[PDB]
Ligand binder design. Structure first.
Ligand code: BL8
Ligand code: CL
Ligand code: CL
Ligand code: CL
Ligand code: CL
Length: 303
């Protein structure tokens, strides 16, 4: 840090090596079911005395009993989310599990909330999507639906053209904010490797733009000797160049949902808040569902 000067002292976004602090991340080796990497906050987040090197079986609570049914790997059910209790004092979490191509089993834990009961909201949302008669109507209904379901201060459909340039194609926002409707932005604002990642990982939640990243410990995977592939991690810390851009805009929190059409990133539903904001698993899942439905309608509309 300060003690190293002289000449030698002078981005792959999926290899962040760190998470956002609203969750905890465990990496488990499946030969022994022991934690081989964890976010540095994990023991305090989960109210455990220790975490790194611990067998899942010995972790206070029921995480192991809750994940066992999903571990047999042929069952091609992952990624999957489980609800469990961990820690002393005990807390309910939702645990999102997936396997990176190498490096073990990742378990990302957020504090659990209640059941969200939006099925009566969702029936008519689905009818508006399925009957929209043009892309203009579809995307205008999309921003309204998402704003209603998520409550973010601004919701946009950010559409990509053939050269990758961004267009704010639809927008809705709370009274008195600035409108970005119809603004165009260069393709460089969403780099190609981000777009590929957003084809894999269809929802991103940035809770607080100002957060301090929480590093994984150890940083390198003990299984691979490389950084952990965090492409599938919903807690992944986001590129600092992006976080600066958001700070420059005065945005505090974001939710983005991919629109994938014919296997390409067609656009994004992009939501901004002016205070920190988190949407829990059950709501993210509904967002994902809506985005699949929208992409189906876009495919039909385009011919
Ligand atoms: C209304 C205006 C608006 C713009 C222009 C905007 C750009 C944008 N950049 C990104 C992502 C990234 N941008 C950049 C890079 C830059 N951006 C710049 O302005 C610089 C020239 C350039 C270096 C700072 C990078 C690396 C990402 C990936 C973020 C990540 O997923 O970690 C996303 C996806 C957000 C998400 O999925 O959470 C969007 C939507 N997001 C917006 O809401
Ligand atoms: Cl393993
Ligand atoms: Cl159309
Ligand atoms: Cl139009
Ligand atoms: Cl404030």
């Amino acid at each position: 840090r300060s003690m190293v000067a002289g000449h030698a002292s002078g981005e792959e976004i999926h290899l962040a090596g760190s998470i956002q602090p609203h969750g905890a991340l465990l990496v488990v080796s499946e030969h022994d079911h022991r934690v081989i990497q964890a976010s540095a906050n994990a023991a305090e987040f989960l109210n455990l005395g220790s975490v790194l090197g611990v067998p899942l079986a010995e972790i206070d609570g029921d995480l192991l009993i809750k994940i066992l049914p999903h571990l047999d790997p042929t069952a091609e059910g992952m990624p999957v989310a489980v609800r469990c209790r961990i820690g002393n004092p005990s807390t309910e979490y939702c645990g999102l599990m997936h396997r990176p191509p190498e490096g073990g089993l990742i378990i990302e834990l957020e504090r659990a909330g209640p059941s969200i009961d939006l099925s009566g909201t969702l029936a008519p949302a689905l009818e508006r999507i399925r009957t929209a008669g043009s892309l203009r109507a579809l995307c205008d209904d999309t921003v309204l639906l998402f704003q209603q379901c998520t409550g973010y201060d601004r919701v946009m459909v950010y559409r990509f053209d053939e050269q990758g340039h961004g267009l704010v194609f639809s927008e809705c926002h709370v009274p008195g904010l600035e409108s970005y409707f119809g603004n165009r932005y260069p393709s460089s604002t969403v780099p190609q490797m981000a777009r590929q990642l957003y084809v894999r990982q269809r929802v991103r939640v940035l809770v607080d733009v100002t957060y301090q990243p929480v590093p994984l410990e150890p940083r390198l995977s003990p299984l691979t000797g490389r950084d952990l592939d965090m492409s599938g991690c919903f807690l992944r810390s986001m590129s600092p160049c992006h976080l600066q851009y958001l700070k420059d805009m005065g945005v505090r929190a974001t939710l983005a949902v991919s629109l994938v059409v014919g296997g390409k990133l067609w656009g994004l539903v992009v939501c901004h808040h002016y205070l920190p904001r988190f949407i829990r698993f059950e709501l993210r899942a509904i967002c994902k569902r809506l985005a699949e439905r929208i992409a189906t309608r876009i495919t039909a509309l385009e011919s």
